[PDB]
Amino acid sequence: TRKTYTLTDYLKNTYRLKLYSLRWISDHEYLYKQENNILVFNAEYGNSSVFLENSTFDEFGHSINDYSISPDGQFILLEYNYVKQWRHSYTASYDIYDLNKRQLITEERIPNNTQWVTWSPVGHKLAYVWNNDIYVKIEPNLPSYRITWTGKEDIIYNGITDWVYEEEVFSAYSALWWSPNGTFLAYAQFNDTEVPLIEYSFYSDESLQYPKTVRVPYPKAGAVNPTVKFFVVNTDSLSSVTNATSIQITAPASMLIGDHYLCDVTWATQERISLQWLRRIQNYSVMDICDYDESSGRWNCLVARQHIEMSTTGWVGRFRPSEPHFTLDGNSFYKIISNEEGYRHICYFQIDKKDCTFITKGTWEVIGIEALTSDYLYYISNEYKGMPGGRNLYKIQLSDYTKVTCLSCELNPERCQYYSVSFSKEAKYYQLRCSGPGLPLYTLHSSVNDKGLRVLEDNSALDKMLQNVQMPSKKLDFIILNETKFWYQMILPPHFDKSKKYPLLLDVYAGPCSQKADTVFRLNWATYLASTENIIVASFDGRGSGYQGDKIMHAINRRLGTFEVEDQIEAARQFSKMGFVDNKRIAIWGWSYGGYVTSMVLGSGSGVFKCGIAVAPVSRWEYYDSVYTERYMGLPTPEDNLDHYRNSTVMSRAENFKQVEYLLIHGTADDNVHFQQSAQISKALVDVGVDFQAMWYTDEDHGIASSTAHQHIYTHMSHFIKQCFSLP
Amino acid sequence: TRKTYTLTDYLKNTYRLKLYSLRWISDHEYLYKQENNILVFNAEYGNSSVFLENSTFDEFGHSINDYSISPDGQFILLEYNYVKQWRHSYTASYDIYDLNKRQLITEERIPNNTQWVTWSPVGHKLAYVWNNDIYVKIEPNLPSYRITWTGKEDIIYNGITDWVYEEEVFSAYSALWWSPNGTFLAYAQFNDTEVPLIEYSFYSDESLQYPKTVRVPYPKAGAVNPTVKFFVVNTDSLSSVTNATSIQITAPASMLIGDHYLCDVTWATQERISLQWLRRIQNYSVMDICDYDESSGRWNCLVARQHIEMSTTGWVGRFRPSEPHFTLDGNSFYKIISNEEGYRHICYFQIDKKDCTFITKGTWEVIGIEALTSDYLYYISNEYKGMPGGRNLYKIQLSDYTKVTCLSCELNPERCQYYSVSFSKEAKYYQLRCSGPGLPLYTLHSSVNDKGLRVLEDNSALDKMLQNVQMPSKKLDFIILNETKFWYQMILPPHFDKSKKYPLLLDVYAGPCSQKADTVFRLNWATYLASTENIIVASFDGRGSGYQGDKIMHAINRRLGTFEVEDQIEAARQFSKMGFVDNKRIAIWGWSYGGYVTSMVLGSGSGVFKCGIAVAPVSRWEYYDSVYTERYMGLPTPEDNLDHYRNSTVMSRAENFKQVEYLLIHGTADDNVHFQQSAQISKALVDVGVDFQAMWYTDEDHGIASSTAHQHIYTHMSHFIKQCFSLP
Numbered sequence A, B: 001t002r003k004t005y006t007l008t009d010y011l012k013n014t015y016r017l018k019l020y021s022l023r024w025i026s027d028h029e030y031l032y033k034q035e036n037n038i039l040v041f042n043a044e045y046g047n048s049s050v051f052l053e054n055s056t057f058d059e060f061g062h063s064i065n066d067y068s069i070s071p072d073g074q075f076i077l078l079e080y081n082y083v084k085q086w087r088h089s090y091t092a093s094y095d096i097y098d099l100n101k102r103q104l105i106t107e108e109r110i111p112n113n114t115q116w117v118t119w120s121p122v123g124h125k126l127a128y129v130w131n132n133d134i135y136v137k138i139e140p141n142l143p144s145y146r147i148t149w150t151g152k153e154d155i156i157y158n159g160i161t162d163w164v165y166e167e168e169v170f171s172a173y174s175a176l177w178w179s180p181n182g183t184f185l186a187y188a189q190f191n192d193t194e195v196p197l198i199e200y201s202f203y204s205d206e207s208l209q210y211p212k213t214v215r216v217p218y219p220k221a222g223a224v225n226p227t228v229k230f231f232v233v234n235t236d237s238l239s240s241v242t243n244a245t246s247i248q249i250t251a252p253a254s255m256l257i258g259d260h261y262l263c264d265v266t267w268a269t270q271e272r273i274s275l276q277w278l279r280r281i282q283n284y285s286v287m288d289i290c291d292y293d294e295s296s297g298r299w300n301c302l303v304a305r306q307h308i309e310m311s312t313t314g315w316v317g318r319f320r321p322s323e324p325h326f327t328l329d330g331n332s333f334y335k336i337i338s339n340e341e342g343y344r345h346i347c348y349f350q351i352d353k354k355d356c357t358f359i360t361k362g363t364w365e366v367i368g369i370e371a372l373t374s375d376y377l378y379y380i381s382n383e384y385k386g387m388p389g390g391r392n393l394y395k396i397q398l399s400d401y402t403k404v405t406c407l408s409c410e411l412n413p414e415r416c417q418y419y420s421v422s423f424s425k426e427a428k429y430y431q432l433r434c435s436g437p438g439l440p441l442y443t444l445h446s447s448v449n450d451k452g453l454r455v456l457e458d459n460s461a462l463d464k465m466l467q468n469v470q471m472p473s474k475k476l477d478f479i480i481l482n483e484t485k486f487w488y489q490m491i492l493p494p495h496f497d498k499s500k501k502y503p504l505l506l507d508v509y510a511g512p513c514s515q516k517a518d519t520v521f522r523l524n525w526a527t528y529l530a531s532t533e534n535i536i537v538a539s540f541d542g543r544g545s546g547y548q549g550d551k552i553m554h555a556i557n558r559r560l561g562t563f564e565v566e567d568q569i570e571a572a573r574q575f576s577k578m579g580f581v582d583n584k585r586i587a588i589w590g591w592s593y594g595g596y597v598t599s600m601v602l603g604s605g606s607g608v609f610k611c612g613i614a615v616a617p618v619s620r621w622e623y624y625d626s627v628y629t630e631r632y633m634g635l636p637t638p639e640d641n642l643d644h645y646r647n648s649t650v651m652s653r654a655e656n657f658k659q660v661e662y663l664l665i666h667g668t669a670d671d672n673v674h675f676q677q678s679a680q681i682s683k684a685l686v687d688v689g690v691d692f693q694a695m696w697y698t699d700e701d702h703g704i705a706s707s708t709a710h711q712h713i714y715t716h717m718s719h720f721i722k723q724c725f726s727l728p
């Protein structure tokens, strides 16, 4: 009998997915790491040469974390002393290696404790942030020019985001944007002076006698938010003036009237930048398009070029307004926006005309715009077979919108229903990355004729390994509720027999615009539960879920902890009705938003679930950050939505936990969902005399992702589920 | 069949011990609160009068926490708005009621948030501490005189202790000492300027959006300690026009050479005060005896009147040097010190002679001196039947030390083997309080011929209730380790059958000078475990335990986490070989020092224990406070005892937890054993891949003592022990 996929398999990564991570350096060449050597590949022919031999930095004296080659290929930026901060942020040391001299640069080094570094998009200028101020080096071995003098720890951030902008607005630590040819450097400045601090203990190595208190400016719902300013500096003037002026571009009057955010920065041309601003009530956004005025040295944004994007049913964008993609001349752009039917499609704008033209339509959504040439726009959508959980690449002819070609749909339709893409610098080539439902498959293609050039990685090694394993299967389908299709997936045990009754674990996330039913191939905890423990692991996309239009997505507007919670309960009831589920053994688990929904479900008194596990749950919306929470909830004030903030807490449901077995887990150094949130759940449970199981993870953050903690948490959870389900 | 003593019985206090808490107000009368009325009793005859009717404060408008009648009976201090701080400290509001004119004083009230208040020992003066400064009121209706002006939150403490002095030196918040007739007020001042702060989160009610950070000056082992000064003020010469003059009494030269503590203050006469000082290396202490100089207004401590107390085998005193008991003229005193055989006995000192004379001797110890007259000294000891865990009252004739009379031994030998005592003002009467092995028994006696006047409370009500419950029994016995007897107790299930095998829980504390094997009657968690669950609950006093001489007590000097741990393992090994113990079901548990020892035992690799529970454990001595830790461990420096600090941690034993089931529990707001200690244990177990059970208690302190948390922890621990022992 073939072995199963065991817990140790998952935790030790015995069965490894191979990737093909390339970095395009031109329109026809990419870099790829093979046996620690960096190789340069010709895309057209597939031949390679050694770009940088793996012995080059043997005598460097530090383990190199990552590298970045300058666009002109003259220098390599070496990243070491990597110290992680939040989801995206980290600090590091940096050295620059001169590739032509084959020599490390030892003068005017990037300082230690540098927060962010980026090459210009052309050539080899560098911008970096150190002690919250911006510096620019025109040449790697020459002195830096200081751009800002206002940086102040935890207070003023120049060219980097604060906590909430990193996590919820930009999905990045960086807050600087080079113009296309590197002449201008645009940047944001955040001011957190009056933003309250989250404070928590960090215990460190056992050698530390007194715990440290970590203090991070973090606006919880309704609290004082950071303010923001936007500036542009001419880097070509730095060597000519003692102190080059950063020119401010102010937000429009419609934004200045109240609290607001900077939510997008996109350069259109060498002398034109677009900015999107979002009101703190996030159903109203404004794009300004601003041109450099050579005579005054200022940036001016004509009101005739200003574009309003608003929502009557919810917030603007999936998580924020979408980015524009400008035509080469910068006089028009394409942007994903919600159409009159509530489906997200590509609209084409002229910069000085307010009405746009939709170039795609239908009951499906465009996921992203991937590339734009003079003749074609390339985008990813879930159109194919009406499956919201699939992804394919399409090409639309700009001179004739009726001509739309699916580039990926039929390449391998059994194996490949979920694609992403990486285009070369001017879109001459593209790499397709298939991520399921079969094993991932990486292929290279030429744009001139859309022909497949070669297979880059087909995971044949893993395929061979998996043939000797009793792997689970995945079912993706839908149920019909109130004449609406809602999609679900099930990870099914090997040799699945529909005449038997299986225990079921509902794996929940269910946040707004989430999607937990898809065609992606995963090797995870669920794989083990199904393969070794014969547990069905199900997920369901109910009201609030994404990629299916605004009627579904905006259903939870101002009402988190309602329909998305109810729909998970209803999904479990419908799974029972299917006949192969032991109704005495239904469980639920989730992380973060999934931890909140798990806890809300367990506290609902539905009687459907025996047990559940919440990891790093939100418990009360007033504890979570302003940008995310208010997007869906508005403000926690009596004039706005306080009543619902107060009605949607886990704590208020404490008495109902007497009916279930609950395991509550949280990292003590979670900067995102504060340990506070679980500390309040446990206290409410103690106060009503509810017994439950708990586990804290010392010094772990939201990811509980250290090697040892990751192994420990899944091991602890596995015991809990197995006990609940009476599994030996 | 009759009922057992259940978990609910323990948690809801179904079976209540009655007390008889009296307050002596003279040599002949005491106060006793009965049905919220305060009565005055005549000791000779037992007749009473109502002193204060319960309905006197019906319209008060605040719930009264406690009361304190002035020594002259003219006034009553009413305590309300009680807010607990640490083990002893709290703040409260106070009102004074005039018992003669039957009215509340509304003039010059004691302020809210008062930290400490006390009547003078004679009359009706008041001293109180507010905002860390001392105030004196000569008459309750008159303005206070401000004594100190330097008080500053968390920095300068006048007349109250800081955290470490409260917990580990004085066992009290007060640092004020009135002279016997109230002329002088002596006080200490603590300076915590350079003492580091422990910081931890406090979550508060759900409504609090951001957790608070609590910061407490707390010296961990080897850190900067508070400094201390001592002063005396004459309260008879205070002025409304001039600031009060406090006279400093400085520490002896032998103390000033390095870090030191003030460890005892005891008035001898109206004009003579004794002080004991202790070096930070706590094996050297000095008593000064200081006389008021009426012509200069100074306090002079003659060097000829200094008394040195030191230890070559350990520290000085059980937890600190003992208090002196001065004769009427103050020219001599009696003090418990360790004799040349290492047994603590009463020594008689002349104030100006170096050599003292021991008045008691033998292989047993004096527990405390209780009263002193010109003819007799009254003391409690464990001499009787050579049982270190029993306690009886004795008197010794001061003119002939061979004449020692036991006053409690034979009163009721079967019921009463553990006594404490409360004497009237000049020792004319005494109340005996028997606390086991039978139900507590309170009796009143006259000293002149040791007549047993009357039974005050015999708990006959509880006896009647317990007749219908299957109660456990208690065996107190000894084992021999290496020619020395060491005592243990077992709480044995009802109908105990030595032909059956019972699971066994070892209930451990095992701190230095601890005693867990005694004759005290207790109704606690162990009562339930034995009565209802048929578990034997054993405790053992091994090396380091108290009341059996220094050979045993000082065995762990400079070596915590060694012999006291080994001896618990050895006791369990011996119990496991008894015919009535199931060697497959032996568990261990304890709180604080007991949590440390439990964890050290579970990490020993002994294989004797299946499971255990540690509650608020110490895990590493460098995390614990200076005064306690250094008493036993010296300083954590390479030149002193660092090596042993480093090899006595729980964390180093983590790998050995692989073969046990462990439950780790800690309150998040424990100001004493910081949550940090358990946070480091859990991290070490995670790092070696050991699974275990955990529970945090949000906002609970060292006691985990709120009604709801208390019920929850014992419920959780009960489930854990029952699961471990396979009990339904």
Ligand SMILES: *[C@@H]1O[C@H](CO)[C@@H](O[C@@H]2O[C@H](CO)[C@@H](O)[C@H](O)[C@H]2NC(C)=O)[C@H](O)[C@H]1NC(C)=O
Pocket (backbone or CB within 6 Å): A040, A041, A042, A045, A047, A048, A049
């Ligand atoms: C891949 O092969 C091509 C062509 O075979 C290489 O391009 C150059 O080809 C000329 C022939 O005219 C040779 O003289 C050179 O060796 C090549 N140029 C350079 C700059 O090396 C190409 O180099 C190969 N690409 C890689 C990445 O190895």
Ligand SMILES: *[C@@H]1O[C@H](CO)[C@@H](O[C@@H]2O[C@H](CO)[C@@H](O)[C@H](O)[C@H]2NC(C)=O)[C@H](O)[C@H]1NC(C)=O
Pocket (backbone or CB within 6 Å): A150, A156, A191, A192, A193, A194
């Ligand atoms: C960041 O914002 C704060 C206000 O939150 C600014 O601080 C104020 O500055 C003015 C001086 O121009 C003072 O009069 C106020 O006392 C300050 N207010 C507070 C609350 O501190 C600060 O100048 C801003 N910093 C930057 C670089 O823009």
Ligand SMILES: *[C@@H]1O[C@H](CO)[C@@H](O[C@@H]2O[C@H](CO)[C@@H](O)[C@H](O)[C@H]2NC(C)=O)[C@H](O)[C@H]1NC(C)=O
Pocket (backbone or CB within 6 Å): A149, A150, A243
């Ligand atoms: C470069 O120019 C900036 C902008 O004028 C200077 O920043 C100002 O510095 C002064 C005092 O040092 C402050 O009063 C202003 O509030 C600052 N303004 C801003 C926008 O930061 C900066 O100091 C100059 N650097 C040098 C070397 O002169």
Ligand SMILES: *[C@@H]1O[C@H](CO)[C@@H](O[C@@H]2O[C@H](CO)[C@@H](O)[C@H](O)[C@H]2NC(C)=O)[C@H](O)[C@H]1NC(C)=O
Pocket (backbone or CB within 6 Å): A181, A182, A183, A234, A236, A270, A271
């Ligand atoms: C990058 O773009 C910038 C902005 O358009 C160019 O700078 C301008 O160059 C023209 C010459 O064609 C001058 O008339 C302007 O004075 C320049 N403007 C500014 C603001 O500097 C720049 O030359 C381009 N760089 C390269 C390398 O082509």
Ligand SMILES: *[C@@H]1O[C@H](CO)[C@@H](O[C@@H]2O[C@H](CO)[C@@H](O)[C@H](O)[C@H]2NC(C)=O)[C@H](O)[C@H]1NC(C)=O
Pocket (backbone or CB within 6 Å): B093, B109, B110, B111, B112
């Ligand atoms: C202790 O606190 C109370 C409440 O602050 C004080 O009571 C007074 O009455 C009301 C509320 O009960 C307050 O608004 C007044 O400010 C209080 N002041 C006075 C002068 O009556 C009470 O006075 C405080 N006691 C002392 C001794 O300061």
Ligand SMILES: *[C@@H]1O[C@H](CO)[C@@H](O[C@@H]2O[C@H](CO)[C@@H](O)[C@H](O)[C@H]2NC(C)=O)[C@H](O)[C@H]1NC(C)=O
Pocket (backbone or CB within 6 Å): B181, B182, B183, B236, B270, B271, B294
């Ligand atoms: C308490 O004791 C003090 C000190 O012995 C007494 O104060 C002395 O009293 C006599 C008068 O009989 C004076 O001659 C001394 O000068 C006083 N000394 C001081 C320091 O004040 C005091 O009388 C006693 N008080 C009571 C109420 O008995």
Ligand SMILES: *[C@@H]1O[C@H](CO)[C@@H](O[C@@H]2O[C@H](CO)[C@@H](O)[C@H](O)[C@H]2NC(C)=O)[C@H](O)[C@H]1NC(C)=O
Pocket (backbone or CB within 6 Å): B281, B283, B284, B310, B311, B312, B313, B634, B639
């Ligand atoms: C008090 O205890 C200390 C520590 O046990 C003793 O310290 C001695 O003196 C120095 C301290 O640096 C050490 O080098 C010696 O090794 C210690 N002597 C020993 C262990 O015998 C000190 O002697 C003690 N004091 C008394 C009065 O016994």
Ligand SMILES: *C(=N)[C@@H]1CCCN1C(=O)CN[C@@]12C[C@@H]3C[C@@H](C[C@@](O)(C3)C1)C2
Pocket (backbone or CB within 6 Å): A167, A168, A171, A319, A511, A591, A592, A593, A594, A618, A624, A628, A672, A673
């Ligand atoms: C966990 N799910 C917590 C609590 C509720 C929201 N949340 C977040 O972390 C929100 N931040 C993001 C928002 C989206 C989706 C997730 C990844 C992210 O990068 C984009 C950040 C969570």
Ligand SMILES: N=C[C@@H]1CCCN1C(=O)CN[C@@]12C[C@@H]3C[C@@H](C[C@@](O)(C3)C1)C2
Pocket (backbone or CB within 6 Å): B167, B168, B171, B319, B511, B591, B592, B593, B594, B618, B624, B628, B672, B673
């Ligand atoms: N056992 C728990 C923790 C950790 C180790 C010492 N400790 C104390 O609380 C020490 N402080 C005292 C505890 C006991 C015995 C002494 C007097 C006491 O009041 C009660 C405080 C020391």
Ligand SMILES: *[C@@H]1O[C@H](CO)[C@@H](O)[C@H](O)[C@H]1NC(C)=O
Pocket (backbone or CB within 6 Å): A093, A109, A110, A111, A112
């Ligand atoms: C970075 O730190 C190291 C070690 O402290 C030091 O030797 C080096 O000079 C630093 N580099 C720079 C660029 O400051």
Ligand SMILES: *[C@@H]1O[C@H](CO)[C@@H](O)[C@H](O)[C@H]1NC(C)=O
Pocket (backbone or CB within 6 Å): A281, A283, A284, A310, A311, A312, A313, A634
């Ligand atoms: C934005 O939301 C608020 C609260 O729901 C609402 O009052 C306002 O009308 C909305 N704006 C738009 C354009 O829908």
Ligand SMILES: *[C@@H]1O[C@H](CO)[C@@H](O)[C@H](O)[C@H]1NC(C)=O
Pocket (backbone or CB within 6 Å): B040, B041, B042, B045, B047, B048, B049
């Ligand atoms: C007790 O009795 C005596 C004499 O009978 C009496 O005078 C005295 O006041 C009484 N004491 C009390 C406290 O009632």
Ligand SMILES: *[C@@H]1O[C@H](CO)[C@@H](O)[C@H](O)[C@H]1NC(C)=O
Pocket (backbone or CB within 6 Å): B150, B156, B191, B192, B193, B194
């Ligand atoms: C307290 O001690 C500090 C030194 O730690 C000293 O500077 C200060 O004066 C002291 N304060 C008082 C009131 O004694």
Ligand SMILES: *[C@@H]1O[C@H](CO)[C@@H](O)[C@H](O)[C@H]1NC(C)=O
Pocket (backbone or CB within 6 Å): B149, B241, B242, B243
């Ligand atoms: C008493 O001392 C304080 C503090 O030094 C001072 O403010 C006050 O003026 C003094 N009062 C008199 C009467 O000297």
Ligand code: NA
Pocket (backbone or CB within 6 Å): B452, B453, B454, B455
């Ligand atoms: Na009697």
